[PDB]
Amino acid sequence: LEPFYVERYSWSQLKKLLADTRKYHGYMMAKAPHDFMFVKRNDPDGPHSDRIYYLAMSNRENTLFYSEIPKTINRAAVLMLSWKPLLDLFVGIASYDYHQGSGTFLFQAGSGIYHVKDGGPQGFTQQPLRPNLVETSCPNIRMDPKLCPADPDWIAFIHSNDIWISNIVTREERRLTYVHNELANMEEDARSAGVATFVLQEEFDRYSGYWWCPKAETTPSGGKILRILYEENDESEVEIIHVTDSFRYPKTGTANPKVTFKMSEIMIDAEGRIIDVIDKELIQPFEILFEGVEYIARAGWTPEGKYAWSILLDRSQTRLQIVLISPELFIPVEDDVMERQRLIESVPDSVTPLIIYEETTDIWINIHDIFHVFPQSHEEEIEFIFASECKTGFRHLYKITSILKESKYKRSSGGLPAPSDFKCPIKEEIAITSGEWEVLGRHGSNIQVDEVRRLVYFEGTKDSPLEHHLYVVSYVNPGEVTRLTDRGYSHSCCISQHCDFFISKYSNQKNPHCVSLYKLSSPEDDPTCKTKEFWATILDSAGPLPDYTPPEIFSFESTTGFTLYGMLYKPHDLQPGKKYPTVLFIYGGPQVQLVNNRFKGVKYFRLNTLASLGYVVVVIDNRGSCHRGLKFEGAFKYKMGQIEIDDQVEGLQYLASRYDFIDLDRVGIHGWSYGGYLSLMALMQRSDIFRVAIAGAPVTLWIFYDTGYTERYMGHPDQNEQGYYLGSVAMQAEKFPSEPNRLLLLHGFLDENVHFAHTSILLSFLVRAGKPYDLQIYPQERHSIRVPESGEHYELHLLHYLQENLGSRIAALKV
Amino acid sequence: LEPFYVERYSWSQLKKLLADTRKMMAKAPHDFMFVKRNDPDGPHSDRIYYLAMSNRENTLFYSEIPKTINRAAVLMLSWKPLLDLFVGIASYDYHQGSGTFLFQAGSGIYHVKDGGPQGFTQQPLRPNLVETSCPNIRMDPKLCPADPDWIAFIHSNDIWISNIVTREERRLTYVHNELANMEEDARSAGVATFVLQEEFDRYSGYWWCPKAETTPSGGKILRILYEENDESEVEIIHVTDSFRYPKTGTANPKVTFKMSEIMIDAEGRIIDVIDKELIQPFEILFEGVEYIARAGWTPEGKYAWSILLDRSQTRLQIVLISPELFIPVEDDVMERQRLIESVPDSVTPLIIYEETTDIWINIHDIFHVFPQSHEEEIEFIFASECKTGFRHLYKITSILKESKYKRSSGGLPAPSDFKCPIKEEIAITSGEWEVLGRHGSNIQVDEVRRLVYFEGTKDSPLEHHLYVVSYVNPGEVTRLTDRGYSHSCCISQHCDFFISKYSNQKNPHCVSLYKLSSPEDDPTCKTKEFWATILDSAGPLPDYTPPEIFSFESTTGFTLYGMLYKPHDLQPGKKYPTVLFIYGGPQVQLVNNRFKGVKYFRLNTLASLGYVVVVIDNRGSCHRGLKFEGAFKYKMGQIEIDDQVEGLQYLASRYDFIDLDRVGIHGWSYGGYLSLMALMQRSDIFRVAIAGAPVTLWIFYDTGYTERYMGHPDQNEQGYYLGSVAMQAEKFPSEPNRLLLLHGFLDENVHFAHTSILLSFLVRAGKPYDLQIYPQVPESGEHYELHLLHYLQENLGSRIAALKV
Ligand SMILES: *C(=O)C(CC)(CC)C(=O)Nc1cc(C(=O)OC)cc(C(=O)N2CCN(Cc3ccc(Br)cc3)CC2)c1
Ligand SMILES: *C(=O)C(CC)(CC)C(=O)Nc1cc(C(=O)OC)cc(C(=O)N2CCN(Cc3ccc(Br)cc3)CC2)c1
Known part of the structure; x- marks a missing residue:
């Protein structure tokens, strides 16, 4: 079997090649319609049952659209809903609040908080609405604005880590909490009110720290009491970190913020003006x-x-x-x-x-x-x-x-x-449910409870660990689960609050994401039984991209007693009697699953480019990856870095004994974050298998990462001395190769999750150990590779690096 | 004419070649002072005191200068330790009348006495700590020349004084508070700020008045002149704490002169201190x-x-x-x-x-x-x-x-x-040569014979020599040091002895004492006689081949000097890969008749491997006068590489072993800069550039340096633009393996800022680069030399290097 050698392009050629095949995307495309709301028309004589409000990009601002749901369709044709802008504009909206009683929208759009009215007593617009600024005296940007559900004249927002309220009719503005001072320095002033601190935003996806009581308590006087529950955080004991401002990062084994709950009791007179504000603390x-x-x-x-x-x-x-x-x-x-x-x-x-x-x-x-x-x-x-x-x-x-x-x-x-x-x-x-599969409850996945029919809608892996589907089951006599979405796609859905419609954003390997509306009904004889009919397209597929060749999904019966899934990109223009160099792309860490039946053309397009240059590409979900239950996720508890490359090598050897075109003497590995970590682990533990590791924003020291993540998976470092030692690549710089052009580090200097500190301490121990390394730094942009300028140079350097040190004839002659 | 290909060594083999050949050096005796013994009966004229490293503390020694020598023999002075020790002393103060020494060593300010009226010790002395209540490090201590019981020093950027007899301590200035941070409080007294330390070599900001005026009562007034500095308006910058860096075109500190008038009674106690300020x-x-x-x-x-x-x-x-x-x-x-x-x-x-x-x-x-x-x-x-x-x-x-x-x-x-x-x-002096006044070089004035001793380039721009000339009827200049060595000297305060530290290309540094004399008929005439050795030459280093100094007349109208390191075991009919080492900036001269085997030892290692190493002092370099220095005013980066190329062609047309198709360039700081400028401007000549701690953007560098050579930025937007490589990323090559950046993360004058901003612009322009970072040392230097040799081998020198292109 003869080795295949990737055509040795030049940096100018490879730049142009990349610039030609990128006729689309920047690691993402226009945000698909999301954050759907269903409002009933309630007009006996009108053609439309419902208006749906959503956020979408039509490079445009994320903003609010509506579409009309007709009472009936031509079941012969396909209705493409048309997008009607809700707002006049002369940034973007990332979220929005709604009060159905009044039809009041509230949203942040840049520095400004705005409101508009649609779908309440005042009726439905046929034209874009002018956003009304909530006037303020506050000097700094207001954040996280929310309507009082008990009374939609009142909103709350955060300003310099304190909670404020403002009345969008009377224009009365009032500070509720006095815990922070903008003029004092964050070394001195480290208390906040109504704001989720770093670890709760980054490691638990909680973005808000205050909650409006949904009801008002009326006074004898004709007034009322509105209430706000909020967390209060004292971050004094928490480590600070400097990143070319400062901020509070609980490092593993160090102090989390001191936390309590507080209650703001706001008294309003009959005319809707503030009488008093009483700040309240827990009895103990x-x-x-x-x-x-x-x-x-x-x-x-x-x-x-x-x-x-x-x-x-x-x-x-x-x-x-x-x-x-x-x-x-x-x-x-x-x-x-x-x-x-x-x-x-x-x-x-x-x-x-x-x-x-x-x-x-x-x-x-x-x-x-x-x-x-x-x-x-x-x-x-x-x-x-x-x-x-x-x-x-x-x-x-x-x-x-x-x-x-x-x-x-x-x-x-x-x-x-x-x-x-x-x-x-x-x-x-x-x-309500059971079996060897999971209900999803993270990243937009939730339930919708129908309290009239006593049903709950939920998304799950019941049909396949490789597709999310929509399901319904009774919560009173749990039995039959009905799958509402169609097999051969992975679905991300939501359900009307009225429980007569659902939307699905769905894709597969061949097919870019689409978004479609489905009507729900019951056989006249059993309101418990649920059927779906297609109603309308919200977003049409581009269809199979003319250039992009999707990978194939494979599985192997691991010696560990689990089926493992992977993706394989056969090299383009495959030849008989030639074995091609192999790039393994890896994440490999908790809470993520790379291998499923979704379109990988937007974000993983360049795995196709790689294939178009003559590389076999492999992706594997090792033990510890998600959507396969807690036992499978729990394999690496205390042992992060010890089991992951075993599964990667097992799957690579499985593929090798099946396809002679895999050249096991030319394996490179490449990942970001946890994937950067495992790229380093792989070169360190298995230099026999892997010729090159490219590690992007790697964790190199578990004590340099945060409390909420590393303690969940690794416990306290006092109780796992060897886990932390063995798990921390920087502590093992002497196990790296003494031959250069095998190890390439990539990191942004201003990275806020995986700090440059990880690369810089690894570099210190590589230098003390007399070991070679290559380095690419993206000096600014914080998101580093997400921003296209840094991203295009990364793609370029990466393609060249693999050509020069794995793929090409010269690479072979270098060893 | 065949190409020569350096042996392709593994990483592990290069590390071994480097650790085997490796095995700053101990600091030579310096800061000399001559004290007369005044003992008609004893064998010695003078005791000399000096600092020296015997990997030891830099400390205080004395030696005995005998009244006669055995002219058939060579006297080695023995180093006798002044201090009874079981950190270092950087400098010392002395007061002839009392025989009092004052020196910092680590945290502590100390004193001992020798050569005063108490006489000369024959044994090491116990250093006497000056007791303090000051919580922080005391800095920059100085004896009051008027009264050696009184010292001054700096603590938390104020002037204190202290009495070593009475234990009386006193703060003189209240200009800064230590419990307050540095963004608020940027006031300092008696301390030279960043640009004057780094760009003018001024380290002290206060000066004892050398005489005391008597008070009618039988007390006295001591004075201290001092600069007071306000850095409020000055830019702040940080590195992984923060400091006040006057970026070019921005605010230098607010400065005044102040005068502390200190009032002492007959018993040596402070009556009062009045701080005084300028009348306008x-x-x-x-x-x-x-x-x-x-x-x-x-x-x-x-x-x-x-x-x-x-x-x-x-x-x-x-x-x-x-x-x-x-x-x-x-x-x-x-x-x-x-x-x-x-x-x-x-x-x-x-x-x-x-x-x-x-x-x-x-x-x-x-x-x-x-x-x-x-x-x-x-x-x-x-x-x-x-x-x-x-x-x-x-x-x-x-x-x-x-x-x-x-x-x-x-x-x-x-x-x-x-x-x-x-x-x-x-x-007093004149000619196409200069008197030296920088880095230790100075004059000694003999007021009895009306002579001045001074150092200069009169004999060669490649050798510093000691000379003496009358200041009353300036005539003949007499050279006192010998040709074939570059000398760094000091003269006894008594103008009857000098010490030279001297070296040349073959011979490591040596320190000798020379007696000065006059013939009886003409007190104005000076002769010298070898008296004793203080520090013996190491002898020639046994596997170091020195470079040769070449010259060339040049199209610019100047002679330009260079060093050439020939490939070891040179073969006939083989042209060899060439490495240019460069600084090229103002205030430095690389090319002179001095020992290069300590700092530039690895130039000789490169030659041993099969590289042709070349060094050239382009226009803008020093020891060649102001017009030569002035060639790049407003034009830094634009003229330096012409001179380097010219010199390389000169050598190439004179020597065929120089392979012009495989030229590499390497330097640090200004050398790092010219390295980038060379690959930017002359990719036809330079296959590879290796830039260490380079300047990439002149607006990023300080007031005192850059405004001297390039003007205020507002009146030289074009020169700042053309001398800033970060503003010209598009001009670098679009093939990799040609550009290597090296930078310390924690670099103090050439901030990493220069490297990140160039990287940021290299990325904008879709241009390739290799990088090495040294985040915090011998370990770092070892890794650099290894990474460097490997990079040159793989990307310039070896067989695989020429296949790669
Ligand atoms: C790790 O999890 C980190 C690393 C920066 C930081 C915590 C991360 O967030 N990675 C990451 C994040 C985003 C994102 O959308 O942020 C809002 C995007 C990406 C991303 O696009 N990449 C990098 C490239 N990878 C595919 C690829 C392979 C080969 C080639 Br030639 C090009 C591209 C996909 C992941 C990362
Ligand atoms: C520039 O002026 C800077 C860069 C760090 C300051 C911003 C500088 O000071 N350079 C510099 C200073 C010293 C020094 O005196 O510190 C105590 C030493 C050095 C130094 O290490 N070098 C660089 C290497 N040089 C020659 C060499 C060539 C090839 C090889 Br394989 C090894 C060594 C010797 C001087 C720099």
Whole structure:
């Protein structure tokens, strides 16, 4: 079998070749319609059932569109919905709030907060609407604006890490919290109000830190009380890091912010003006009420506003509690310590945190966005749907009834609560779903509960670990699960709040993403049984790209007892009796799955380019990758970096003994982030297999990464001395090759997740160890390769590097 | 004519070749001082004290100079340690009258006594810590010449004084607070700021008045002149803490002179300190003046002096400043208004010297002031390039006229209002060669025989020599050091001995003592006699082949010198890959008759491998006069590479072993710059450029350096553009393996900023580059030399290098 050698292009040729095949994209394309809302027309004589509002790009601003849903279609034809701009514009909108009662939209668009009215009592527009600025006196950019659901004249926003409110009719503006000072330096002033800190945004996808009570409590006076639950964070003890401003980064094994809950009680007169603002604090400290809690993972309100709820995690992230928090647990902030004593005694001992759910695992808690509270029908019971892996090892929906009874803990006795004094008994716990597959609850995946038909819609892997599908099941007598989406695609969906329509954004390997609307119905005889009919296209496919050759999906029966899936890009113009150089592309880390039946043409296009130059490309989902349950994810607990390259090599050898065109003496490996890490691990542990590793923004030292990620997967470094040692490439610089042109590092200097520090400390230990390395730095742009200028130079340098040191004739003659 | 191909070594083999051949060096005796023994009966004339490294502490030694020698033998002086030790001393202070030494060593300021009226020790002395309550490091300690019980030092950027007999300690300035950060508080007293340390080699910012004035009571007044500096307006920059860096075209600090008047009773205790300030702000008195380049006192402390430069560094002034120009710092403007009006209007600054150039002023350490023979005259020696374009000694008499201008007339002074009439201005030296005044080079003045000893390039621009000349009837210049060595000397304060440290290409550095004599008939004539060795040459290094010095007449009208390292085991009919080593910037000369086997040892290693190493001092380099230096004014980056190429063609048409198709270029700092400029401008000549810590963008560099050679940026947008490689990324090649950048992350004057910004623009332009970073040392240097040899082999030298293209 004769080696194939990639045509040795020049840097000028390779630049032009890249510039010609990039007639589209910048690692992403126009954002597909998203954040759908369904509003009923309610016109007996009109042709349209519903108006749908969404965000999309028509290089254009992300903004708000609507489309008309007709009552009936030509079932012969295909209706392409037309996009009607909602807004007049003379940046972008990333999200929006809506109040159905009033038809009020609220959204940030650059520095400005705007509002417009559509779909309420005032009716439906046939023309773009003028966004109305919410006038402010605040000097700095306002962030994270939200309508009071109890009263849509009122909004809240954040300004210099404090919570403010503003009335969009009266223009009254009022600061609620006094915890931060913009003029003091972030070394001195490290307290915030209503803002998710770094680890909760980066490692748990919680972006908001305050929650409006959805109901107003009327006064005797004809006024009302509006309420805001908010987290308050003291980041003083937290490590600072400087990146050519500063910021607060809890490094593994170091302090997370000090956290509590607070309650702002806002009194309004009959005319809608502020009488008073009372800031309120927990009757006892957070550490006393919620013992062992590190992380406030999610929070909000019960539907009637009777309770705040939170999902609370311990530091090890192996204990999850759901807790109800009555607003009566909060008392005014009071400086007079006798007056404060009187406020403490004034609240009954019967008023206590209510742990309505608690679970533990020896692997990890994966936080998700699934939690639905049914209307209370009795004061002593709450009924809710939650999702959990902790019962069977696959994430399933459970319908739970918890009993809300008095604690044995009486605060009057002057003692401190015992570890389970707030545990609620479970009256009932029922599995709504089960089996060797998972319900999705992350990255837009959620449930829609139909409380009239007693159904829940959910997305899952039931049909295949390689496609997300939409499903419905009864939550009252769980039996039959109906798949609502069609096989041969992966679906990302949402359901109308009215439960008579669903939208799917779907793709496969051959076919770019499309977005289509589906009507839902019931056979006249059984409202429980659900059928779908096609209604309309929102976004048409481009169809198979004229140049792009999709990969093939393969699987192998691993010795570890799991099926492993992979993608294979056969080289273009394959020849008999020639074996081609192989690039393995890897992520390999938790919470990600590369191999599924979706279009890889937008973001992984250049794996096709590589194939067009004469490289075999391989991608494998090693143990630890997601959508295969907690046991499969749990393989590397404490052992990150130890098992991943085994699976990669096993799959590569599987492919090699099946296809003689794979040249095992010319394997390169390339990844970003966790994939950068495994590229380094691969060259270090298996220099026999891998000729070259290109490591992009690698983790090189687990103690330099953050609390929320590394402790979930690796525990505390005191309890895993060898895991941290073996897992940390920088601690093992002496195991790298002593021959150059095998190791290439790539990093941006201003990277905010994986710091340049990882590359720079690796470089220090490579230098002390007398080891060669190549380096490409993207000096600015923070996103480094996401920004096209840095990205095109990366693609270019990468293609040349593989040509010079793996692919070409010269490369062979260099060794 | 066949190509030669360097052996292709593995990484591991190059590391071995490098560790085997490897095996700064110990610092040679320096900071010499001669003390007479005055013992008619004893065998010694003088004790000398000096600092030296015996991998040891730099510390204080003495040796004994005998009254006679055995002329048949060679005397090696023995090094006797002055200090009883079980960090380093960088410098020391001494007071002849008391025999008191003062030196910092680490955290501690210390003192001992020797050679005073207590006499000479025969055994090491215990250093005496000056006790302090100051929480932080004390800096820059100095004996009060008037009273050796009194020292000064800097703590948290204020001037303190302390008494080594009484234990009395006192803060003199309250200009900075340490519990407050540095973005708020940018005020310092007695401390030279970043640009004067780095660009003018001024390290102290306060100066003891050398005489004490008596108080009627039997007490006295000590004085300290000092610069006060406000860096508020000056730009801040950070590296992985932060500092005040005057970027070119932006704010230099606000500067004044201040005077601390210290009052002591008969028993040596402080009665009071009055801080005093200029009677009219610095800008009023010192029109046009950006930098305080140098300051000090006349020998009897009547006037303070300063050498003042304008921002463009083309106007130099020497100024006498009477302590009578300073008045107490007063809150209440009523009480203030008498102090102002009382000071006579006759008391004015006296500009005793002024000069101007269309190139630039080179600041130096030569300034000697004679005793005041007459109240209306000052007599001094200064050195200047400003007449002939070569640095020469001048004897000047300036008349100290009452100024035309009056301060009671509520007026503002005109420019020439403080100028002093030049009575007399006699050239002591002249010719197409320069007196040296920088980096230790200075004069010693013999006031009894009316002689001045000085160092110069009279004999060759390749060798520094010691010379002596009369300053009264300047005539014959006598060279005192021997041809075939470059010398760095100091002269005894008694003008009867000198010490030379000298080396040449073959011979590592050596330090010898020479007795000076006069024949009885003519005290004015000088002879020298070898007296003793202080530091023996290592002897020739046993596997170092020195380079040869070549020259060439050049189309620019100047002789240009270079070093040529021939390939070892040279073969006939084989042309060899060529490496150009370069600095090329101002204030440096690489090419001279000195030992190169310590710093440039690896030039010889490159030659051993089969490379032709070449070094060339282009126009802009030093020791060749101001016109030669001036060739690149406004034009840095534009002319240097012509000279390098010219010299390479010269060698190529004279020697056929030079393969012009395989030329590499390598330098650091300004050398890194010219390395990029060379691949940018002349890719036809240079296959590969290896730039270490390069300047890539002149707006990124500081005031004191870049505005001297390139002007304010506003009036040279074109020169700043054409000399900034970061503003010209598109001109680099579009094949890789030709451009290698090396930079320390934590680099202090050539910030990584230069490298990242060039990378940022290389990426914009879709151009390839190799990079090595050294994030925090011998380990780094080892890796660089290995990475360098490997890079040259793989991309210039070897067989595979020529296949690759
Ligand atoms: C790791 O997870 C990091 C590395 C920068 C940082 C935490 C990361 O976020 N990677 C990453 C992020 C985005 C993004 O969309 O940010 C908003 C995009 C990309 C990305 O586009 N890449 C780089 C290129 N990879 C495919 C590829 C292979 C070969 C060739 Br020649 C070109 C392109 C896809 C991942 C990364
Ligand atoms: C430039 O002027 C800078 C760059 C770091 C300052 C910004 C500089 O100071 N250069 C420089 C300074 C010293 C020094 O005196 O520090 C105590 C030393 C050196 C130095 O290391 N070099 C560079 C290597 N040189 C020749 C060489 C050629 C080939 C090989 Br394989 C090895 C060595 C000797 C001097 C730089």
